[PDB]
Structure 1
Amino acid sequence: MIIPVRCFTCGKIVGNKWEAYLGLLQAEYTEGDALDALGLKRYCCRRMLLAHVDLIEKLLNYAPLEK
């Protein structure tokens, strides 16, 4: 689905770092470093962004966003 606002574990807001993240992977592939530049030090916030799958982009392709 979409990225959950605010990491489950601790509470730090995180949806805001998603779009910035995909730009980093196109740049510096060092996923550790990319996560680091976004400021997600502690690993629960890091798993949050690290493990997510952005399923919405597939979902958007169904013709009828009308139903």
Structure 2
Amino acid sequence: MIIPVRCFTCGKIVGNKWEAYLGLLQAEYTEGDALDALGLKRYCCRRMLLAHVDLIEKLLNYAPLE
């Protein structure tokens, strides 16, 4: 829904990388090159950003009750 703070397997910080990863993908990087530029070497950290579904953006399209 939102990017996890830690990689589930190892605990590397990936919560500060989702917007940087989206900006790299917008800058015509491939997904592998964007993951390599962010220092995600292990494939456990790469599945964090590769397989993330950012559902919070679509949740923010609803008017808040509070």
TM-score after normalising by structure 2: 0.93
* 1:15-49: CA deviation from partner (whole Å, max 9, x where unpaired): 01111010011112311001100010110000011
Query: What is the DSSP-based 3-state SS (H/G/I as helix, E as strand, rest coil) of the residue aligned with 2:16?
Result: helix
Q: Which runs of 5+ in 1 are unaligned?
A: none
Matched, 1:3 2:26: no
Are residues 46 and 65 of structure 1, via their aligned partners in 2, closer, same or farther at CA, if it must alter by over 3 Å?
farther
- Give the Cα–Cα distance (whole angstroms) in 2 for the partners of residues 27 and 5 of structure 1: 24
Between the two proteins, the alignment pairs up a number of residues equal to: 66
Are residues 63 and 34 of structure 1, via their aligned partners in 2, closer, same or farther at CA, if it must alter by over 3 Å?
same
What is the percentage of aligned positions where both structures have the same residue?
A: 100
Q: Which runs of 5+ in 2 are unaligned?
A: none
Q: Which moved more, 1:44-53 or 1:23-32?
A: 23-32
- Give the Cα–Cα distance (whole angstroms) in 2 for the partners of residues 45 and 65 of structure 1: 35
Runs of 4+ that moved beyond 6 A: none
